[PDB]
């Protein structure tokens, strides 16, 4: 499930 502390802007590489 989505981690609320995670940053969506991260490079997913």
């Amino acid at each position, epitope marked *: 499930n989505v981690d609320p*502390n*995670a940053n*969506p*802007n991260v*490079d997913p590489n």
Partner: antibody, heavy 119, light 110 residues
């Protein structure tokens, strides 16, 4: 202090193009995503999409796929919204807004840019 | 909208009022990434609640939020004239997308 400062009001004819700027300060521009939100007259806020400031990958909500472009210029920590082939129903106040995390979206907002499209 | 809010609510100074936000789609999943924004006209919206109930420091402690089932609620206590504004709920809806509720006009009957 985190600031998002947008360019001034625009008055356009249908078919014209417009480019709204969203200049940031007080944080590292490429650390956080820049989102865009619209409010048409007599309507509510509508999420338009966002651009990833590390990868450049844009995401557009349905309704904003076709004539809209999210971009940025890291040299001046600025995000842009460009609209091609403007329609009367593009008339709205456009906002930029940062997302900090999935839990905390839209923590800082630009002040809004009014774009009026009229014949 | 994917999130249904009452068009308007009204209250007198001192009272408490509650604004509902109901998901009309399972795209919200567990519906735990719900945020609320206060919007005075001609100004930028302001974050007042996130993750259903978390009020950040710098938002008034008269703002609170809860949920039951698929309905999230914002409650404003000790209603004051400056609370008059539009209020929007907001949810994550998967695949790095968000959606706002239709908005609620709050009138403080002063």
């Amino acid at each position: 202090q985190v600031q998002l400062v947008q360019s001034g009001s625009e008055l356009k004819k249908p078919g014209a193009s417009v480019k709204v700027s969203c200049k940031t300060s007080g944080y590292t521009f490429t650390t956080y995503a820049m989102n865009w939100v619209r409010q048409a007259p007599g309507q509510g806020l509508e999420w338009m999409g966002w651009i990833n400031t590390n990868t450049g990958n844009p995401t557009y909500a349905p309704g904003f796929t076709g004539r809209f472009v999210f971009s940025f210029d890291t040299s001046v920590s600025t995000a842009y919204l460009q609209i091609s082939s403007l329609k009367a129903e593009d008339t709205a106040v456009y906002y930029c807004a940062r997302v900090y995390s999935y839990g905390v979206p839209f923590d800082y907002w630009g002040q809004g840019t009014l774009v009026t499209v009229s014949s | 909208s994917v999130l249904t809010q009452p068009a308007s609510v009204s209250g007198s100074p001192g009272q408490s009022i509650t604004i509902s936000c109901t998901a009309t789609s399972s795209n919200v999943g567990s519906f735990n990434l719900v945020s609320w924004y206060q919007h005075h006209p001609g100004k930028a919206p302001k974050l007042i609640i996130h993750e259903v109930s978390k009020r950040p420091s710098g938002a008034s402690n008269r703002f609170s939020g809860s949920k039951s089932g698929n309905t999230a609620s914002l409650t404003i206590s000790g209603l004051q004239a400056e609370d008059e504004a539009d209020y929007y709920c907001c949810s994550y809806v998967g695949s790095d997308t968000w959606v706002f509720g239709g908005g609620t006009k709050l009138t403080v009957l002063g």
